[PDB]
Amino acid sequence: ATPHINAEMGDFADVVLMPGDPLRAKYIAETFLEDAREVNNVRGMLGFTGTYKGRKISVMGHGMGIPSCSIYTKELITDFGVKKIIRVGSCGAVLPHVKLRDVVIGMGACTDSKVNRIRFKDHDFAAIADFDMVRNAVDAAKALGIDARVGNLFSADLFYSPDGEMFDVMEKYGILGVEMEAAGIYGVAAEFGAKALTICTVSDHIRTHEQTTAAERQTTFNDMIKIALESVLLGDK
Amino acid sequence: ATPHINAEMGDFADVVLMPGDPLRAKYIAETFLEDAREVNNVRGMLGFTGTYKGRKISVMGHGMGIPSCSIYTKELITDFGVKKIIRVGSCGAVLPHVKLRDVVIGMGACTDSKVNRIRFKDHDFAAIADFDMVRNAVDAAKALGIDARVGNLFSADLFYSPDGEMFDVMEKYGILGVEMEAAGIYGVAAEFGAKALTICTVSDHIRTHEQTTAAERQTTFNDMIKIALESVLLGDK
Amino acid sequence: ATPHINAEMGDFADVVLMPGDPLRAKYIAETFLEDAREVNNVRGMLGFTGTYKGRKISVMGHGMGIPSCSIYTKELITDFGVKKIIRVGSCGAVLPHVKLRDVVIGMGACTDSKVNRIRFKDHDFAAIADFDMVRNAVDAAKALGIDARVGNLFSADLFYSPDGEMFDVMEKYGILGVEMEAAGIYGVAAEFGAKALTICTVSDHIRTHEQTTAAERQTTFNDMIKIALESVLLGDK
Amino acid sequence: ATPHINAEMGDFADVVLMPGDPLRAKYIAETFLEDAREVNNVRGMLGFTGTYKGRKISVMGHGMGIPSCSIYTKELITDFGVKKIIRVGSCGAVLPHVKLRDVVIGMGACTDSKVNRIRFKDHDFAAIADFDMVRNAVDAAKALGIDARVGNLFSADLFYSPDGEMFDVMEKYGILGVEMEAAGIYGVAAEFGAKALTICTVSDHIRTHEQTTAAERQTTFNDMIKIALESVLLGDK
Amino acid sequence: ATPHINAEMGDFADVVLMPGDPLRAKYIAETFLEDAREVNNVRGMLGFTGTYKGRKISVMGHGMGIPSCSIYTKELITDFGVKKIIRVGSCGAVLPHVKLRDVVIGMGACTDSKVNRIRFKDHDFAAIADFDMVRNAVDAAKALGIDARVGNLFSADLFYSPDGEMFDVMEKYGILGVEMEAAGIYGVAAEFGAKALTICTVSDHIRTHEQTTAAERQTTFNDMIKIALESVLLGDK
Amino acid sequence: ATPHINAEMGDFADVVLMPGDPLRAKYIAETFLEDAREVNNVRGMLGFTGTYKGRKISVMGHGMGIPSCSIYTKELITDFGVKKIIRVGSCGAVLPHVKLRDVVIGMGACTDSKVNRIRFKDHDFAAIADFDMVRNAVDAAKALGIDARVGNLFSADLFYSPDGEMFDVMEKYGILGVEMEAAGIYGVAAEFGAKALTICTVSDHIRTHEQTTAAERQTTFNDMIKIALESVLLGDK
Ligand SMILES: c1cn2c(n1)ncc1nc[nH]c12
Ligand SMILES: c1cn2c(n1)ncc1nc[nH]c12
Ligand SMILES: c1cn2c(n1)ncc1nc[nH]c12
Ligand SMILES: c1cn2c(n1)ncc1nc[nH]c12
Ligand SMILES: c1cn2c(n1)ncc1nc[nH]c12
Ligand SMILES: c1cn2c(n1)ncc1nc[nH]c12
């Protein structure tokens, strides 16, 4: 066991899909995995392991924010042999042409967190996904006939930001979605020697204020899960 | 409702105790509150409302880290009429004289997060509790026979720090306990015009190891909750 | 002797009251202390030691600004055995409900100085007073029929700030008074293991031009000194 | 003409390969392009336009450093209709398994420059290449049977760095090559609305001090040029 | 009058000499000026105006540290028509070839204060003296048989620095003397359109403990004042 | 040789004039030096050595921007025995009273680069010229009948700034000219123990437009070169 995960080596597959919401992890386990068993419930952060088309796969919540997901991804990498993390999250759009339920793939993640400056001597660490994992997700989306944009996310510390003008800067620089985790997960992957990718579904539009419900976020973002799971199968080959 | 809390105005008391662990919110409600009902379950972040000695009180998890607790505390304040937040958590000690099971009250909270610099034009915002709430907690602890330490917490973004050297710095400057939330809660309270307090029990020494029993640790945890609840009654007058 | 204080261990009491204006030290000694003796004259920063209701007390100015008061408070703590520093001074108000001549007690002090970032590995140190000293001052004021406000000061490096918009930020975040020392004194106290408190009276509103009389100012200054002295006696228990 | 390029709209192709060294641009034009004409020599920064397998292509030096290449890439994008910039550069290796003459593809670029903080409100902008261009370069390398690693570059302002320990941090975080431009080019591409990729040949090993000569850098890094040119042809399809 | 100077326009000369120690103002007036009159006494910061070889000169202390001297220099420039400020003070040396009692002229002043970053959009403002004033002081010293050194001072906020290693950095970069004001005075002069110069004598070596006699110190202080006064006459041409 | 200069010790004089444009180095050598030979052509960065009035002098381009000129100046100092660098360049004016064709001498250079913060523990290094070199240039200009302005330059990383507002800040603080090198050259000179000076002629007003002729601009350019060369002869004694 680790301080936040009551499990043992082998309980997790070498690939873990991670939404922020543990109830979405449970939905993924029930809907997409066969023979799923629950492997963690410390702090209610449900994690499960099962098979997808014969391939061992885990799915576990990571909580909201860089500090929360950095705990879980670290422990999985250092004590559970996890080689790849695929975050399957929600995000808010700033660009006019990005719509609710669009799927975005974060090849990079900007951030207003200090965590990577702490790692990188106060310089600019480009928080990037693993290239092969990005390519796997693009190819899986194409085979599924699901559109997906590839580019930069913005990992915010404040969902309720006091700096509304920064959204204009994100829009200027082409940010595809605002979420709260990717840059921290990518920093962990680099620090602890694993590979990661963030895929998000647009759940809110920051300008129009249109927003999905909590239930919709929990059980209706299926395109993104299919892409993630099929991308693993491509990577295995 | 908000995207993270499926509740309506009135479902929460005007004071909310918040542990990090939602299962601990359930523990608190079942142990200390009468006539308690669940008022939120979005993302598994259980919240409850009941009475303590006739006084309406809520308890709800806040998740790990400044970004997670900043969402919940903001929404409680702006959308549910909440006037006081009391975080009730665990912390790690760096000072030799601070012992396992000491009760620490964070009159201030240091941090390595950027969130308050974002709020405060890149200057130093002293993230502080409400003075009257601190005094109520000190007085409640005295009435219970507990000698609480009052001082600075350190709210960390990285539970797994790359910078081991920062613990020596915290020790030098008298930090009583390391946790992951107080400075963010205090920033939200100041931003949105509410009042907050963090109380923690020392659950470990970051460097060394002392010996306690589960029974003794759980007794002290309950003492912290009793301090928080009794402090509300003192504030009510 | 130290570089800025020509005195020896024992010449200062363990508690030192410190106005900014050096001319106030002699006034305090003559007006409030019995049997006062001169203990420093270096650079004209006159220091005196006497008794208040039998309790040994010293008084010496600290000069304007964080760098000045950091010199004197350090030397007093490390070379003269001083355990408590009470700054007694003036501040400017930004909040419309804070009135001329109000007593403000800085439980915390925000700042635009770099000194605490230099100390604290470029993170946010919450520059805080000693809690017991805060409560002692609150209680001493109440016994004198004065309701002091407790909260954050802002310790500015530039009395003449080029950033006028910062005052609106200070107001939004509840800053009770703008002065030039508290955050630096609090950082010294933490660095060298002592206790400190800043008490100020509101001399002006930053934005308006309302006036006081000379008799009002003397009455209010005397009230502040009485609060500070009586607060020490409460701290002795 | 623009302030640093004496040419007119149409003189450049919509894709420009750019080494830092204008003499390498001349070598590329003479060796790989047919019917190449010189289109700029302001400040000696030679640029040429010709055809590669029938496809109009330009090649022009960008000088050393983020400030230099930001001038040329901006002017090309805003006044010459340039849609894609492919930097074809040299870099120094920090990782033990990276050897002289290895080809590296910068999907991201870390930096110690302030230019992206100036663009991005002092937050972390993840300076990333265009994904399709990265994929085109990977595929072209595979078809040519040339090995290429994809990952992060580090764009340094100081070739002669006073902070040798930062090379340990780069190595820790998996930096494939240290150069002086990519993060600035990627920032320009995002600011001015174009697409960019940096490909480098390892010209030095920072730990072993093995180094290619000036002549070798100028006329013997051919794998990288073939990859860049063939990648354009893939992108056209 | 201004908040810290009880005087009217015309009471100060257009040139003000400013020691740090307020007691030096009267000494300078009595020793070097003819017909001196008292023009300020607020907070004990005595100011005087007289003539030197017929030329109107004022003298008033500035207090220790950037925040203190920034107040007085601003008020003198904006409300008293002061055109030139000459700080005359002491500094500590880090270079082994810089000797006790050497005269150092700060053509520039490095700093660890934030005041110039606040002024200059968080970029690097080179805090510089007026060139003619520098050369006037060099020439006045040479006419008195003194070879002054011209270069960078370092203006520290913390006389008691927690970062001992910074002195080695100062030495590597050629800093001639450590004091606490020049960079702040130079920033005020630039902000408000006036001219300034800091001259210091080396009172100590930061690392060693070598001593001077009281007669040596007075002789050297008088030499500095003579340099400053004669330099003004050279500036008048 | 170095990777950027194909020359040997002795090929350069101990003083090197450096324009940004290598074609301008050729212009200077051909116009002002006798018996001049080319000593470098790596990357097209032409350098030459000849005599001016019998005195051995070199001239070599430095490229655009702090990173480019930092390479060349470091290598000249550490590997070619160079003791003095004189940058001879163009700058843009922000002050209304600074006119086209004024000669500006940078006694200091502000910057938005991070290079000096990297050198100087993230504090403010005042990037300054060598005083004696400044004086030599002022005196040479006077002997030629030119009234050079001495003050601060601003060395920009982005010729195309996103922050138009910074030009108003430069104007407020008295910046005489905007270029892209001086602060970096001055940092190299301090780091490696050499001496440097930047002279520029005003080639444009960043905001407005005045009218000159090519003949007049070229005359003033030549005056700058004459000032630089004659200043060396004065320094030689
Ligand atoms: C879904 C939305 N969303 C988010 N997840 N994270 C941060 C954020 N800021 C605005 N909107 C946001
Ligand atoms: C309880 C919490 N806690 C801890 N014990 N130890 C270290 C630590 N860092 C952040 N939070 C921490
Ligand atoms: C008393 C103090 N004070 C003030 N009144 N107003 C503005 C201000 N800034 C620093 N200190 C200040
Ligand atoms: C080739 C090498 N190289 C470079 N290009 N740029 C920066 C740098 N730092 C070390 N070695 C470097
Ligand atoms: C005279 C001044 N001085 C000194 N001697 N030594 C160290 C120091 N730090 C700031 N100012 C200082
Ligand atoms: C000559 C140079 N120069 C200029 N004229 N104008 C603006 C500018 N920014 C950097 N360098 C500049």
mmCIF file of C-alpha atoms in Angstrom, chain C residues 3-4 20-23 41 43-44 64-68 70-72 74-75 90 112-115 117-119 157-160 162 180 191-192, chain E residues 3-4 20-23 41 43-44 64-68 70-72 74-75 90 112-115 117-119 157-160 162 180 191-192:
data_model
loop_
_atom_site.group_PDB
_atom_site.id
_atom_site.type_symbol
_atom_site.label_atom_id
_atom_site.label_comp_id
_atom_site.label_asym_id
_atom_site.label_seq_id
_atom_site.Cartn_x
_atom_site.Cartn_y
_atom_site.Cartn_z
ATOM 1 C CA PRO C 3 26.698 47.733 14.956
ATOM 2 C CA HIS C 4 23.620 49.938 15.596
ATOM 3 C CA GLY C 20 8.904 54.539 13.967
ATOM 4 C CA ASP C 21 9.571 58.161 14.883
ATOM 5 C CA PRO C 22 12.672 58.134 17.148
ATOM 6 C CA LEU C 23 11.345 61.155 19.079
ATOM 7 C CA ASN C 41 21.999 56.861 21.373
ATOM 8 C CA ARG C 43 22.499 57.407 15.089
ATOM 9 C CA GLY C 44 20.103 59.311 17.349
ATOM 10 C CA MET C 64 11.005 53.915 8.647
ATOM 11 C CA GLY C 65 10.803 50.860 6.437
ATOM 12 C CA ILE C 66 11.448 47.135 6.528
ATOM 13 C CA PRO C 67 15.266 47.347 6.167
ATOM 14 C CA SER C 68 15.571 49.787 9.095
ATOM 15 C CA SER C 70 14.894 44.583 10.496
ATOM 16 C CA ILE C 71 18.304 45.787 11.705
ATOM 17 C CA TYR C 72 17.123 46.876 15.134
ATOM 18 C CA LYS C 74 17.491 41.418 14.782
ATOM 19 C CA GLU C 75 20.148 42.978 17.019
ATOM 20 C CA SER C 90 0.544 54.874 12.280
ATOM 21 C CA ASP C 112 5.561 44.079 -1.544
ATOM 22 C CA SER C 113 9.079 43.645 -0.090
ATOM 23 C CA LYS C 114 11.282 40.780 -1.246
ATOM 24 C CA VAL C 115 12.746 40.084 2.211
ATOM 25 C CA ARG C 117 10.912 35.567 -0.341
ATOM 26 C CA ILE C 118 14.678 35.785 0.168
ATOM 27 C CA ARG C 119 14.227 33.965 3.486
ATOM 28 C CA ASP C 157 8.402 49.485 0.596
ATOM 29 C CA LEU C 158 7.263 52.571 -1.350
ATOM 30 C CA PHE C 159 5.260 55.117 0.623
ATOM 31 C CA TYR C 160 4.925 56.838 -2.792
ATOM 32 C CA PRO C 162 3.735 54.074 -8.639
ATOM 33 C CA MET C 180 6.005 50.032 6.262
ATOM 34 C CA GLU C 191 13.984 33.884 11.592
ATOM 35 C CA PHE C 192 15.440 34.350 15.070
ATOM 36 C CA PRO E 3 4.382 64.326 5.182
ATOM 37 C CA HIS E 4 8.013 63.942 6.373
ATOM 38 C CA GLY E 20 22.296 57.916 6.569
ATOM 39 C CA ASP E 21 22.998 58.807 10.190
ATOM 40 C CA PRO E 22 20.817 61.868 10.976
ATOM 41 C CA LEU E 23 23.459 63.185 13.405
ATOM 42 C CA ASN E 41 13.163 68.661 12.299
ATOM 43 C CA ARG E 43 11.042 62.770 13.210
ATOM 44 C CA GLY E 44 14.433 64.147 14.249
ATOM 45 C CA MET E 64 18.656 53.464 6.787
ATOM 46 C CA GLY E 65 17.318 51.442 3.893
ATOM 47 C CA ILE E 66 15.682 51.897 0.515
ATOM 48 C CA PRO E 67 12.153 52.642 1.839
ATOM 49 C CA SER E 68 13.429 55.411 4.147
ATOM 50 C CA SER E 70 12.951 56.810 -1.081
ATOM 51 C CA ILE E 71 10.537 58.891 1.013
ATOM 52 C CA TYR E 72 12.923 61.776 1.579
ATOM 53 C CA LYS E 74 10.911 61.812 -3.520
ATOM 54 C CA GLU E 75 9.585 64.641 -1.344
ATOM 55 C CA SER E 90 29.532 53.874 4.530
ATOM 56 C CA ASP E 112 17.831 42.629 -3.803
ATOM 57 C CA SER E 113 14.917 45.056 -3.253
ATOM 58 C CA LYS E 114 11.745 44.725 -5.310
ATOM 59 C CA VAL E 115 11.211 48.487 -5.685
ATOM 60 C CA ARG E 117 10.842 45.737 -10.438
ATOM 61 C CA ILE E 118 7.615 47.300 -9.156
ATOM 62 C CA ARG E 119 8.464 50.432 -11.156
ATOM 63 C CA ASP E 157 17.419 45.231 2.108
ATOM 64 C CA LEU E 158 18.784 42.891 4.804
ATOM 65 C CA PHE E 159 21.918 44.076 6.581
ATOM 66 C CA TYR E 160 21.730 40.630 8.262
ATOM 67 C CA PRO E 162 20.323 34.830 5.500
ATOM 68 C CA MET E 180 21.407 49.931 1.717
ATOM 69 C CA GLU E 191 11.014 58.117 -11.618
ATOM 70 C CA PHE E 192 10.827 61.841 -10.884
#
